[PDB]
Design a protein around this nucleic acid. Sequence first.
RNA 1: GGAUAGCUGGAGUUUUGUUAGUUUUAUCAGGUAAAGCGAAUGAUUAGAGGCCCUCGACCUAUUCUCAAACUUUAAAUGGGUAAGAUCCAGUGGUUACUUCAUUGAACUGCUGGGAUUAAUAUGACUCCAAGUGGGCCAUUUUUGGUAAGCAGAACUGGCGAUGAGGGAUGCUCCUAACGCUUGGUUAAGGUGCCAAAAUGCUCGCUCAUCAGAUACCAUAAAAGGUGUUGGUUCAUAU
RNA 2: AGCGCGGGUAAACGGCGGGAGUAAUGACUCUCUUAAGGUAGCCAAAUGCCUCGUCAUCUAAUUAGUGACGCGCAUGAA
RNA 3: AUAGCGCAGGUGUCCUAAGGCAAGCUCAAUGAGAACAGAAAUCUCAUGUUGACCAAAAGGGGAAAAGCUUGCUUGAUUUUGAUUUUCAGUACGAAUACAAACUGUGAAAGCAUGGCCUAUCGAUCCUUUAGGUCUGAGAAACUUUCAGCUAGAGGUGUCAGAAAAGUUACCACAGGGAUAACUGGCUUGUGGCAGCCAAGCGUUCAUAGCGACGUUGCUUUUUGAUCCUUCGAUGUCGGCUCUUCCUAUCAUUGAGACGCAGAAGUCUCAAAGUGUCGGAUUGUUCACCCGCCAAUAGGGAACGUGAGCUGGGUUUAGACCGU
RNA 4: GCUGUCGGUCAUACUGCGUCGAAUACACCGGAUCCCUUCAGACCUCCGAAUUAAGCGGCGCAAGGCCCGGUUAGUACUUGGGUGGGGGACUCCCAGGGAAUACCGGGUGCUGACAGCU
Lengths: 154, 49, 97, 193, 261
Amino acid sequence: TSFGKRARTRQKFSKGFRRHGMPAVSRLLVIHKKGDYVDIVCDPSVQKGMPYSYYHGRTGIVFNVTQRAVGVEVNKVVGNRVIKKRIHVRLEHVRKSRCNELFLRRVKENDAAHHEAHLKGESIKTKRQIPGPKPGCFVSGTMEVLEPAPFVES
Amino acid sequence: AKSKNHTNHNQNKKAHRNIKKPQRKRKMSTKGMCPKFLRNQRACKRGMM
Amino acid sequence: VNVPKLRNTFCKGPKCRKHQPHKVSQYKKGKDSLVVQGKRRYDRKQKGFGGQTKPIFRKKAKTTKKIVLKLECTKCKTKRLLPIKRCKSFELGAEKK
Amino acid sequence: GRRPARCYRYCKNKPYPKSRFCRGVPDAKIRIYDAGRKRADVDEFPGVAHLVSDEYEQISSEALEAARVCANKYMIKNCGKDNFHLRIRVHPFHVLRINKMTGMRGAFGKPMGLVARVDIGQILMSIRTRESNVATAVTALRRAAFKFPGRQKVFVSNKWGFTKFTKVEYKKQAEGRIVDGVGAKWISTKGPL
Amino acid sequence: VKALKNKAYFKRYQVKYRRRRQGKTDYAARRALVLQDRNKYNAHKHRLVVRLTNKRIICQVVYSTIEGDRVLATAESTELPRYGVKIGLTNYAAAYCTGLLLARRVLKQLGMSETFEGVETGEEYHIEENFGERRPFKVLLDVGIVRTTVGNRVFGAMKGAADGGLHVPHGIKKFPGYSYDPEAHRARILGLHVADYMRQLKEEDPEKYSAQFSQYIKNKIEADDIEAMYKNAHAQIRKNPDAVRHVKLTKAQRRERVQQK
RNA sequence: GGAUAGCUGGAGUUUUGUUAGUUUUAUCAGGUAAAGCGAAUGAUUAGAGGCCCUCGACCUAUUCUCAAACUUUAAAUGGGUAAGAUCCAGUGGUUACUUCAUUGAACUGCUGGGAUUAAUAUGACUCCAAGUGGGCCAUUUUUGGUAAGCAGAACUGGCGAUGAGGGAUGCUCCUAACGCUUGGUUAAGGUGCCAAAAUGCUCGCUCAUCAGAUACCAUAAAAGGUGUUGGUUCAUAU
RNA sequence: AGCGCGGGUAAACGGCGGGAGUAAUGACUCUCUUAAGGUAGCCAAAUGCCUCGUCAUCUAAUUAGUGACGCGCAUGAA
RNA sequence: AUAGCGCAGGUGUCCUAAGGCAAGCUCAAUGAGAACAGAAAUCUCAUGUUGACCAAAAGGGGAAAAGCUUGCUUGAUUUUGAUUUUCAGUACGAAUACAAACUGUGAAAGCAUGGCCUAUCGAUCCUUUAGGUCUGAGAAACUUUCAGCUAGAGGUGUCAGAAAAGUUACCACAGGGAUAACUGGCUUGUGGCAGCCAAGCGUUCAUAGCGACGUUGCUUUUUGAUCCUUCGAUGUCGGCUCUUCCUAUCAUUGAGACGCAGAAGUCUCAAAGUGUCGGAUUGUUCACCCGCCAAUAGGGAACGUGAGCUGGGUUUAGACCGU
RNA sequence: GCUGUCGGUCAUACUGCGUCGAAUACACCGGAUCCCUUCAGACCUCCGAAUUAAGCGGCGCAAGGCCCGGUUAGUACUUGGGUGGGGGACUCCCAGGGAAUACCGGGUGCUGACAGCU
């Protein structure tokens, strides 16, 4: 086949439908502190600093912040091993990740829950519960008698 | 006398035989950070000695 | 391709270290000469019998060569070589569009 | 010498229609699809019979031409020229390749001719006619089945002409939602006014 | 013929944002102003917003947030009847007086009034001055989509801010008098070009001098008196901060209206 | 044919609340299958309604059928990241960086809060070197070709390197993987005889002057039959 | 010196044309082009692809043989 | 991520502007209008989501711009590193994000390290020039020439980079069924044979005999397609001789149908029990004639049959002609 | 309840056509001496103060568009299993996931900062 920086991009780098024109200003006012997760989505509208195609849609940790760019460490399988790769990228092509935000909420409630016992002797054992089997109750309402259907061609 | 051009067969099975993940480390490596920034981390560390 | 003769650019030299104007010549090679070690080693080696030693290159692919500009500073007379991309047509006479 | 049509029964390849990429145009043998009286209005010709495939096939353009010339000639003798409409619904857009005569190498081949793809349950022909007829119009499509490959069930539907509407649901016409030939158009309460 | 604006035309049709449709914001120039790098993290880039409406000159200091832009302190030329200047609110003199009157009440809000007196007229000035000490308050200039000529009223209000002691970055090249002449710029601040036009026009005509400048005849201001006002306005400013139908129809109500028609 | 990486062995250590070809919880990326054309682009049948005709024109609303290099919309199966002792908060200091500013930023000192913070299972570098770099097959996906026990790919599993029981017989199908053995129980598959086990029980269908008989598999079709056994729906017992 | 520049030499190596129109046929006219455009002769040849060429002859019957006929794939003058 | 001598195309360039920045403006197209003037000139209004244009293939991207027009300029500059892409996580090339200079444009924010993004290119050795108050020619100075250190250029298109024409039928060696020319095997387009439907032909009448436009099979007696077997050899055409087998039956036996009066036939069923010839030309297989006959049907058995023959052909070495 | 300046989401916000807008205020609007712009004071620029018609805002339209839900549909398609069916083409069962038009029931906005107005 043929290899180019943007080969097979077509659908992948397409702007979208009715989504043409430049980035909005409020998305350009997002801050990214180092030690923070970000999903690399590249918008073809800006051709400056767009990352390579493989990294598109990859979540990874911000290690640097250049003035007009964000150093993101992502990770990449090469047969036998993962290897952590360090890719700079323009500000428009980075989104804030939302993958961590349940865990970030969770710790504030969970650490405050363990805190507040003190002399009652904590040992709360705070933990999510996976919704397995339901217990039993009586249930009653209006009924219908169904039967199976004869075939019709139409 | 061809012969086969290419194949991905038995390559996933070979890789998974051993897919090592790099060990996590405290304190992030600074290779590829700003030179201006890393100048002031040296000047920082000097000032507390 | 067309290029002006006058040209403001950086002067990598001891006095200036800033943008001066420069004079844009072309760079040609200049003659290969004798008494240079590789030419002397080539001459002793090809004396005698045994035909000739080194490869003679035969089969060129390229039409073009890379155009070097010889810059030359006005004030201090520093020079250097800028390369430029390849082309068949080169000049640095005027006639603008 | 064209091929036997056992060669090109099955839908082995992706559709390859006549475009800017194909360029070799072989032109079809059906450039007359509709037949009988084309111009009759919907208030006449309530009865209908479809010819429906049960089998996932290709059908050549010549086999469609053969089948319509079969069926409309059976109409002309029995029930006259001017008491039927006969549509061919299927079109041949798939273009079909031949390599002709180191054995391979130049294996990719030129475009021979046209062919139509056909699903299970897909409608091939439809005769629209008077309820007087119908039984004659079924036996017009028992004939036309022999020109195609595979089997095709013949199917008297319950619908007035070439419309969505059931012939029960058509006649409740009087209230005047419905008002065009070969197409009963529904007047909506949707506007403007 | 096929005629304008199909059903399928409106399907395809993307919209420009809204303040492009309304015809106000340039989103090209907005993206250049609002960026402040990522080495700075969470600094706020302030900008002076001068807008020439009719009869009035609005002047704001503004930084941006994700919810919206956020005003630090406003100024209006309609305030200036407080500080001596009765009329001539749209002109270049009033633009300078608004930009000065703004620039004090940025400093008074932060608590930085005694530092940065600035430089009271029409001579060139940047703030390289003050060394070994706190740096002057940085603020850009957003013209908007006022077309940027030599003169215009906006660089009046820029020079008002520079007198006030806000660090505006600016070249000299779009001031009046330009190769630069400072005393020609002093004529525009003190309203001398306005007085010289009245001095030219009154000896020529009574009818033009009645038709224009009718408010000047009411408020009793002569050709000689103009340069006194805008000078004396400045000392008045610098001892002062500021001091204070139909409705929709339901779908029951809509099908009611059909059977009327 | 080499070199190089991978697959493999051996020799040393570090080291045990850390690993995963898995799901869940939350969050993203994608443009295949289908669908679409009374949505753009491209292909396409049919008529309707807009100085004497006239098929035209073109327009307006409809209609027949489509697309590997068309698309508004858009699955399943797969892919990324996160789920705490390598953590969270409070407070002081360092700094040529950053700020209009002890404002921030990153790094650090101290003081609290917390022992495994979804499920299930489970202990997790360095060196030296061999052989190998002709592969083939099967289910699904799929390209060239009339097709091939043909050529070329994708995912997984086999054969090759591998016997045992079944498919009469078969490198690749099924069951199932092997230390020497005593007893018990099954798998796939079978029970008239060859042949270990049913001429077992019970209910239908079939008469062949070429019956039929067990996946891969060792070929059969269009079209017929008042041969027989049932069903569906009309019309006067047929 | 040679090679260039300028002559000679084919019983030196060798080479020796197409297209329309015109009393079925083309003596004849026109046209593009070569260093020269195959002359005298001979031919389906030990040399002709189409080809078992066409017409005589030998035969009851001849893809053979002989004698003629030539736009001759690709005959021809030490 | 992913193959084929898969599919549709493209590159070895072009440009001091088509580079850079800022400002102003809006394009293709349609509609209605204006002397000469129309289907096409120029001017004007209205509408115009990109239907134009951006050096060139195709695809992304773009509307107070990335398009068009003007103004000012040379960041297509200098110093070396890091990263991404191919990937062994080597190199080249290409690109991205900073750092330290110095300039351009703009009021300023900014933007600019060539082209809006995706292609447009090259190691060692050798030669060559640019740079330094530089290092060395080893007995020591001076001073030409030389050798160095750093960065470009001269080129390898077989593009990780030898310096390179034929012929062998006089042939040789190591090997290869990884790979052709025979049989056999899979396949059956092509060849051959048999069905289904019924437009017409058949004076009249679709079906005695036929059968278009379509469509379903069979065969391995043709020819391809393929490369599984065989290269430490299975003796490659044709004829002669001799045997057997098949039936898709040319004749002979017994039937049935007819456009069957008789005679002569054409069609179909049971039929392989018996029979299928003499010669001219060609190496022929085929073919084409002369004749006979009840009839001169088609095929298989390693394209039956070379320790059975023959050697005319093909296919060694000699020689002739033509190209 | 509103008007302005800077915005956020970027059509529930667009487009077409028609009626109505207290009060600031936006706006049309008057002028060319200087700053400044061209063929041209139309645009732009500067200096002004003698009608809501448009712009702008609200509302309507059996409007188009757009957004939201119900149908379409447990259908199309599809993951794992089958010594299931079928001569093939394809199709059914078991354990799971599960769309999209067509067509009618409701909508046509919400909002942060700052200065002012019944």
